[PDB]
Design a protein around this ligand. Structure first.
Ligand SMILES: COC1=C(OC)C(=O)C(C/C=C(\C)CC/C=C(\C)CC/C=C(\C)CC/C=C(\C)CC/C=C(\C)CC/C=C(\C)CC/C=C(\C)CC/C=C(\C)CC/C=C(\C)CCC=C(C)C)=C(C)C1=O
Ligand SMILES: CCCCCCCCCCCCCCCCCC(=O)OC[C@H](COP(=O)([O-])OCC[N+](C)(C)C)OC(=O)CCCCCCCCCCCCCCCCC
Ligand code: SF4
Ligand code: SF4
Ligand code: SF4
Lengths: 99, 158, 185, 46, 71, 181, 376, 323, 127
């Protein structure tokens, strides 16, 4: 179910927390969906999800926050449904002109 | 390697090719708007049952996949999965322009630029839609192509 | 033709939400605000002399120049009085507009299609999953800035034994021919 | 014949499906006995 | 020019230019019987029931005679 | 469902007016009259003549305005009929035609490269009707199924040889259709 | 429990073989038709409408041409209008025949399929004689048609109409009145008129309940207001009444075909103005202005005035509408394609509720979902 | 000794007849549908069954690996055994029987009863649950219509004192039992149509429809063996129909011109008419839903069969017409 | 060629249809073109015997007889041969397309082409 736009930063934060809860509860299903038990590190996956949420802090618009949460829930549903020293300049220079 | 063993091998290969040519059991992959023309091919006028063609709904019993219609990125995994279930003696007929090189939707998102990118297709049937005459020509061309299969000779000379 | 219930609506409909009206032979047009669209459609559907009780369709138009690029259009029909009406609003990428699934149950799939093609989210949709494009599609294809050929393409990867999705590398690039005449204006 | 007892075959005004070659399509489209003349404008606007 | 394309050997005005297109023959074709005509000329319900009953009775009589002969 | 029940009772009373009608209906439902009639029609079509075309020896009817295989023609003298006006790909909805050209040795405008994808052509005849010189025509041939996509990718030499091969039939169809133009 | 079927993908929730709910997944034939139409000129975009709802080809051409003429205000000659009506009714006959016989095959009846395909082969021969190909014939263009009728076509169509009256009687005798056919159809997927209006049904699926509304009579977009045909309605909307409505529509299409053949006039086949309709080959090879206009119409296109409109026609499936928004340029700015399969496939959910799997496939056949138009 | 020779001479021509029966079904259905069947593999398609069998043999097999390999493989074997051993008793003329069992009718009824196990095990051993459900549906339908078939057998057994098919025919000498019991013959024909999953009541062959079937998982030879068993059962029940309600190897009116025909020709001709009726009904009619056909079997044919049993018994007991 | 009827069955149908037919023509490749009017349905009143019973192909019909066989024209192949253009033109060739790399058509850039042409649209310095 889709909800109206959050009118407060606190409401946006609560929705973000709910989405993170949903991701954490749906993590073990992805285990049996993908079967990468050798180097998954479920804790590392949770850390990466938290890192994505933390790199998406520069946004301050509640509408943008709600849209990002909607797209994240969509991505969660898709993943559940199994849908997949020479400096940086010199390497690009040796690779191609367009960099 | 001899000249009489070679003759016997040639006769055996001819019999095998005759059987496989006269008992083709293709399966329709009927997307978009070459499937209607395919049903016209299977109709009374250009009948396919005469040559041995009968459409098997189960991919496990089918001989060759006839992909007629547009291949979508959402449907290409299904096409590949269904193709993988077919028995090892297998062939592919790409009917129309969508299944050949993308056709009229070549420059479009969610359109596979021909079924050749997903499955190894043996014979292309140009047209949009190809006439039922032309599709039956393509099936006869498949018969001709499998009429030169020296499987027994290749197995013998290994 | 049949501009009867359109004029009757403008006579009886509250004037608060009628942002603008267009009397045309190509179709009578109502343009309103996104806040009052649900109320306006509820009035039209339920009123006894403007019974547009069937929703023809919901469409989206992209206008990159305007501040609110997306234009959501609703084509409705009145079979009792035999006339078509058009009600449209303007929405941008982030703001969510009201859903009319409760009034017209057919609006669910058209609203999902609008979401898929443009990104205009709806407030009270029972579900708003993508309907038309591939599973895991990233962009909104019908936006003007979206490239015609898309961003990714699929192929069969033999080592993976599956159909993988890779960034586009298409041969025979699309040839845009500029036929526009400088004297057309 | 058993099918004239009842049904559409018993109807005197019943038409066969197969068209005869001597009456269906007498002249091939590329060889028509009379030459066409298709107008392209009104006589006034000439 | 339309007159140049559709010129007539002896025409004076742009009117009465030669014309010949696909169309009805003089008489306007014939009616085609859009409706349906399904005649029900089969045997009546009572007739087939009487036939079946009489057939059953006479057949049982024949069964009795055949059983007597076989006995 | 009470309305449905009373409607059913009313209908049953309506179609049970008398013993003759009820007996007729019961006999019809018991002795499979409609099934027998369908069987009789099926037997009639079993004994009637067939409409199978016998493909390889007998081929279905066509029209001179048939959109088969793209091809390029020539003038009766022998020169290429195709000037490089580039109206082919300007109108080709599928963008299946690619053309490049330059001035020839004698100053004539001719195409130095002209290829058509038969896997991208939608066989619509827009080019053959946009040609100002009737150079490209969609020939009557349609049985040109190839085993390879690269074979299905045509070019100028193949189009010209197709036109030379099918010149007489293409000319007959072009006469018949230029009548209809 | 959820049962999955895999271009028709459908997931069904079942309890006791009884279908609690059905959810279709449709995108399997999405092709970016609207995006490509936006990227291409109007004439180059007509084949897209050819491809949409491919069972009924020329109905989409008629809708697109009517929308373009509405946005363009160009008068179509009477002969062009009459031949457009004739071929639209031929298209309706083709679509109804295919829908009925595919429905019969899905039910289990296999034999009428090939008889109706013989009829369809005759009609496709008509298409191939009048235009380029048997299917996807870009014959109907804005302002008129591509070419004039070949001589003898009217006589052949008359012969077909007589034999086809016989064939419709034949098919109705075999299918209608069969106990198995009745048990398969009656009281299956019934829709109230309120439900149909709510879910946006059109055509047979809307007249089945008995709303008593047809587009050819409500908004006559052709000589339809001079053809005095009949529009059948269903007493209680279900599969059987929709099938009977389709049979009656085939009969009335034959009636309209005969009327058009009888009263077809003699004149031109397209709009008189060469700014909007291409000149003939002789005219472009003989006249300087005609050569200019042919060149400009085949490189550029006709620049429609900047406006937005919705034009709907009575396609055999139902109401097929095109919403065209222009900006004064030679390419359509926006083209929304409302197909009468998108709403019906929504209706599948409530139609096939408390039914079974065979009832679900029967409902699909009755609705006649062509996935090209629903994935437009 | 001679018994294996007789058994082989019964089995191999039965397989040839099954192949030409599927060919004849194609030809008759095509001629019904205004087309022509297989005509390009040999003259009039006479080599089409040979080509099909050779292709099926040469097709490379696949192993589903369903953890029930033995049961998966042996189910078509079981149904093939059942069809053949059912054919082991049917007479063709006076003295052309392998086992002249005095209980031949009940033997055929028992063999028909055993026939459901092949399909049930095929559905269960398959990984997919759709195949299991389809096998259950087909088994239940065969169950109901075999109950009806047994009641019809009881009617015939009331008519004829003995229980062996040869003496049944010897009693048929007079009136063929079809003249007295044409409705019973019609019900038996519909019941055997539903018994072999042929014509209407065709659930497994509705693969294009949602019911699917029990043969989806099976490989080339498993599917071929199931098809051969089904068609051998079709021929078997056509022979049962002609031995029960058409007199078997008996001419018409006992004229001396008709007695020149050996009688095995008569039995073959009657079986051919019954097979033509099979293909006729399959081509001419739609198919029933599973619930519809089950209700029809349990509510229309069972009461009618019981009523006909009672009526025949009452007619025979009342009058001296008793053997 | 009558012994081919037993293992062909399609040539058998053709020979059955050539009972009351009239040989309307023959081409330079040996194909014999027959017409049969009267009590014959429309779709089966013109046909061809390819005179190559072993491996007859649908593409062996020359363009001169293609239209007449496909019912496009009432003109037989003899008239079209008379009207065949001069100063240019090639003989009819069947749709081999699989009979050999030396027979099939190859693009100018294909590696199988006898002469493969580079495509760069610039001339390097080439010291
Ligand atoms: C509708 O689709 C389908 C088809 O299409 C029509 C098919 O054909 C098939 C496959 C059907 C078949 C009938 C394939 C089997 C082919 C056969 C020929 C059956 C096998 C018969 C034998 C092995 C008996 C032959 C034995 C001989 C000739 C020995 C002769 C002995 C003597 C003369 C005495 C001793 C010496 C399937 C499943 C199908 O589903
Ligand atoms: C003293 C005794 C005197 C007896 C006189 C004669 C009385 C005969 C009454 C019994 C008839 C039995 C034969 C018909 C029968 O079984 O009908 C059952 C039924 C008739 O009833 P029904 O089942 O069709 O009816 C619809 C369902 N109800 C009952 C709810 C209305 O027949 C069928 O079901 C037909 C199924 C399809 C058959 C397809 C094959 C047909 C082959 C050719 C047949 C000719
Ligand atoms: S190739 Fe043409 S006819 Fe075939 S599916 Fe594509 S658009 Fe339709
Ligand atoms: S027929 Fe149409 S698609 Fe083919 S090359 Fe010509 S314009 Fe392009
Ligand atoms: S339109 Fe004609 S002249 Fe122009 S490029 Fe094409 S073939 Fe050549």
């Amino acid at each position: 179910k889709v909800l109206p736009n959050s009118a407060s930063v606190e409401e946006a934060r609560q929705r973000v927390f709910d989405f993170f809860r949903a991701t954490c509860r749906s993590l073990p299903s992805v285990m049996e969906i993908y079967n990468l038990y050798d180097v998954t590190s479920v804790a590392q996956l949770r850390s990466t999800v938290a890192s994505e949420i933390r790199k998406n802090i520069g946004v301050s618009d509640p509408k943008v926050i709600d849209m990002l949460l909607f797209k994240g829930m969509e991505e969660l549903m898709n993943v559940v449904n199994h849908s997949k020293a020479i400096s940086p300049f010199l390497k690009n220079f040796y690779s191609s002109n367009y960099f | 390697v001899s000249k009489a063993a070679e003759f016997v091998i040639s006769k055996v290969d001819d019999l095998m090719n005759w059987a496989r040519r006269g008992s083709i059991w293709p399966m329709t992959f009927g997307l978009a708007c070459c499937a209607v023309e395919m049903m016209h091919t299977g109709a009374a006028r250009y009948d396919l049952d005469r040559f041995g063609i009968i459409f098997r709904p189960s991919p496990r019993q089918s001989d060759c996949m006839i992909v007629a219609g547009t291949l979508t990125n959402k449907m290409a995994p299904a096409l590949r999965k269904v193709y993988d279930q077919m028995p090892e003696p297998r062939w592919v007929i790409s009917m129309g322009s969508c299944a050949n090189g993308g056709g009229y939707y070549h420059y479009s998102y969610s359109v596979v630029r021909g079924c050749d990118r997903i499955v190894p297709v043996d014979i292309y049937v140009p047209g949009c839609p190809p006439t039922a005459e032309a599709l039956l020509y393509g099936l006869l061309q498949l018969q001709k192509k499998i009429n030169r299969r020296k499987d027994f000779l290749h197995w013998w000379t290994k | 033709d049949n501009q009867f219930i359109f004029k009757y609506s403008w006579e009886t409909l509250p004037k608060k939400w009628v942002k603008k009206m267009e009397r045309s032979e190509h179709g009578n047009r109502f343009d309103t605000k996104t806040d009052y669209l649900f109320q306006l459609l509820c009035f039209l559907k339920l009123h006894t002399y403007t019974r547009v009780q069937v929703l023809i369709d919901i469409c989206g138009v992209d206008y990159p120049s305007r501040k609110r690029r997306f234009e959501v259009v609703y084509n409705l029909l009145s079979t009792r009085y035999n006339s078509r009406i058009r009600v449209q609003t303007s929405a941008d990428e982030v703001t969510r507009i009201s859903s009319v699934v409760s009034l017209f149950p057919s609006a669910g799939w058209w609203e999902r299609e609008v979401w898929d093609m443009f990104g205009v989210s709806f407030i009270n949709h029972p579900d708003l999953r993508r309907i038309l494009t591939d599973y895991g599609f990233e962009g909104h294809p019908l936006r003007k800035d979206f490239p015609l050929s898309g961003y990714v393409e699929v192929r069969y990867d033999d080592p993976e034994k599956r159909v993988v999705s890779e960034p586009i590398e298409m041969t025979q690039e699309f040839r845009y021919f500029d036929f526009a005449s400088p004297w057309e204006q | 014949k058993p099918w004239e007892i009842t049904g559409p075959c018993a109807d005197p005004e019943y038409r066969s499906a197969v068209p005869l070659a001597t009456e269906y399509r007498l002249q091939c489209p590329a060889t028509t006995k009379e030459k066409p003349c298709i107008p392209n404008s009104l006589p006034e606007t000439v | 020019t339309e007159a140049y394309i559709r010129n007539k050997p002896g025409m004076v005005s742009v009117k009465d230019m030669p014309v010949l297109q696909d169309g009805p023959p003089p008489g306007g074709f014939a009616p085609v019987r859009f409706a349906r005509r399904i005649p029900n000329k089969g045997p009546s319900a009572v007739a087939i029931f009487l036939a079946a009953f009489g057939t059953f009775s006479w057949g049982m009589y024949q069964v009795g005679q055949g059983n007597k002969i076989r006995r | 469902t009470k309305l449905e029940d009373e409607q059913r009772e009313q209908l049953a009373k309506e179609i049970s007016k008398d013993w003759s009608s009820v007996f007729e209906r019961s006999i019809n439902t018991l002795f499979l009259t409609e099934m027998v009639r369908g069987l009789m029609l099926t037997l009639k079509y079993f004994f009637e003549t067939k409409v199978t075309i016998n493909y390889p020896f007998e081929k279905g009817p066509l029209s001179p305005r048939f959109r088969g295989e793209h091809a390029l023609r020539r003038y009766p003298t022998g020169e290429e009929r195709c000037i490089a006006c580039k109206l082919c790909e300007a109108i080709c909805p599928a963008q299946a035609i690619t053309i490049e050209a330059e001035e020839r040795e004698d100053g004539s405008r001719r195409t130095t490269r002209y290829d058509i994808d038969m896997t991208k052509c939608i066989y619509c005849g827009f080019c053959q009707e946009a040609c100002p010189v009737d150079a490209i025509v969609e020939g009557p041939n349609f049985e040109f199924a190839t085993e390879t996509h690269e074979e299905l990718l045509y070019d100028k030499e193949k189009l010209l040889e197709n036109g030379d091969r099918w010149e007489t039939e293409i000319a007959e169809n072009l006469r018949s259709e230029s009548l209809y133009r | 429990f959820t049962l999955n079927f895999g271009s028709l993908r459908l997931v069904l929730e079942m309890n006791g073989e009884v279908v609690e709910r059905a959810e279709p997944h449709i995108g399997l034939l999405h092709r970016g038709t609207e995006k490509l139409i936006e990227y291409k000129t109007y004439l180059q975009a007509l084949p897209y409408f050819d491809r949409l709802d491919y069972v009924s080809t020329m109905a989409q051409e008629h809708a697109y041409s009517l929308a373009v003429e509405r946005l363009l205000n160009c008068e179509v000659p009477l002969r062009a209008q009459y031949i457009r009506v004739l071929f639209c009714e031929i298209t309706r006959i083709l679509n109804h025949l295919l829908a009925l016989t595919t429905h019969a095959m899905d039910v289990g009846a296999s034999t009428p399929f090939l008889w109706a395909f013989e009829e369809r082969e005759k009609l496709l021969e008509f298409y191939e004689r009048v235009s380029g190909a048997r299917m996807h014939a870009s014959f109907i263009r804005p302002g008129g048609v591509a070419q004039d009728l070949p001589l003898g076509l009217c006589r052949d169509i008359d012969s077909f109409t007589q034999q086809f009256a016989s064939r419709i009687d034949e098919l109705e005798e075999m299918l209608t009145g069969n106990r198995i056919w009745k048990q398969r159809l009656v009281d299956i997927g019934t829709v109230t008129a309120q439900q149909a209006k709510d879910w946006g049904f059109s055509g047979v699926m809307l007249r089945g309940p008995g709303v008593c509304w047809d587009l050819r009579r409500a908004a006559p977009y052709d000589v339809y207001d001079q053809l005095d045909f009949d529009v059948p309605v269903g007493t209680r909307g279900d599969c059987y009444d929709r099938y009977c409505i389709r049979i009656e529509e085939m009969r009335q299409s034959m009636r309209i075909i005969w009327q058009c053949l009888n009263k077809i006039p003699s004149g031109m086949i397209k709009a008189d103005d060469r700014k909007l309709c291409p000149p003939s080959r002789c005219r472009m090879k003989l006249s300087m202005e005609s050569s200019i206009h042919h060149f400009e119409l085949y490189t550029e296109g006709f620049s429609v005035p900047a406006s937005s409109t919705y034009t709907a026609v009575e396609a055999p499936k139902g109401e097929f509408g095109v919403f065209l928004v222009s900006n004064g340029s030679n390419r359509p700015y926006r083209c929304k394609i409302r197909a009468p399969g998108f709403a019906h496939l929504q209706g599948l959910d409530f139609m096939s509720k408390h039914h079974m799997l065979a009832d679900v496939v029967t409902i699909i056949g009755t609705q006649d979902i062509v996935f090209g138009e629903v994935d437009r | 000794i001679a018994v294996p020779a007789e058994i082989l001479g019964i089995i191999l021509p039965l397989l040839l007849g099954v192949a030409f029966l599927v060919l004849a079904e194609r030809k008759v259905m095509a001629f019904v549908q205004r087309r022509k069947g297989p005509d390009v593999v040999g003259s009039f398609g006479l080599l089409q069954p040979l080509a099909d069998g050779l292709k099926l043999i040469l097709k490379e097999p696949i192993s589903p690996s369903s953890a029930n390999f033995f049961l998966f493989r042996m189910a078509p074997v079981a149904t093939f055994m059942l069809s053949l051993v059912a054919w082991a008793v049917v007479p063709f003329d006076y003295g052309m029987v392998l086992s002249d069992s005095n209980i031949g009718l009940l033997y055929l009824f028992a063999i028909s009863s055993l026939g459901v196990y092949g399909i049930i095990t095929a559905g269960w051993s398959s990984n997919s649950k759709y195949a299991f459900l389809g096998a259950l549906r087909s088994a239940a339908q065969m169950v109901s219509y075999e109950v009806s078939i047994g009641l019809i057998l009881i009617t015939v057994l009331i008519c004829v004192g003995s229980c062996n098919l040869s003496e049944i025919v010897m009693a048929q000498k007079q009136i063929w039992f079809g003249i007295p019991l044409f409705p019973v013959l019609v019900m038996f024909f519909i019941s055997c149509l539903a018994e072999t999953n042929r014509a209407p009541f065709d659930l497994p062959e509705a693969e294009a429809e949602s019911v699917a079937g029990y043969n989806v998982e099976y490989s080339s030879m498993g599917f071929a063996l199931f098809f051969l068993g089904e068609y051998a059962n079709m021929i078997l029940m056509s022979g049962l129909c002609t031995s029960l309600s058409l007199g078997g190897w008996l001419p018409i009116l006992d004229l001396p011109i008709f007695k020149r025909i050996p009688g095995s020709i008569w039995f073959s001709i009657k079986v051919i008419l019954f097979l033509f009726l099979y293909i006729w009904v399959r081509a001419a009619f739609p198919r029933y839903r599973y619930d519809q056909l089950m209700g029809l079997g349990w509510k229309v044919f069972l009461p009618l069969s019981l009523a006909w049993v009672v009526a025949v018994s009452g007619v025979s007991v009342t009058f001296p017409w008793l053997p | 060629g009558y012994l081919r009827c037993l293992p062909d069955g399609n040539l058998l149908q053709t020979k059955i249809h050539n009972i009351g037919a009239t040989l309307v023509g023959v081409d330079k490749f040996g194909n014999k073109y027959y017409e049969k009017l009267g009590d014959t349905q429309y779709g089966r009143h013109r046909w061809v015997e390819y005179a190559e019973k072993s491996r007859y192909n649908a593409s062996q019909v020359p363009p001169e007889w293609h239209g007449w066989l496909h019912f496009i024209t009432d003109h037989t192949g003899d008239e079209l041969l008379l009207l065949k253009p001069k100063r240019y033109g090639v003989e009819h060739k069947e749709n081999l397309s699989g009979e050999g790399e030396q027979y099939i058509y190859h693009s100018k850039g294909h590696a199988l082409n006898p002469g493969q042409r580079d495509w760069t649209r610039y001339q390097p310095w080439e010291s």
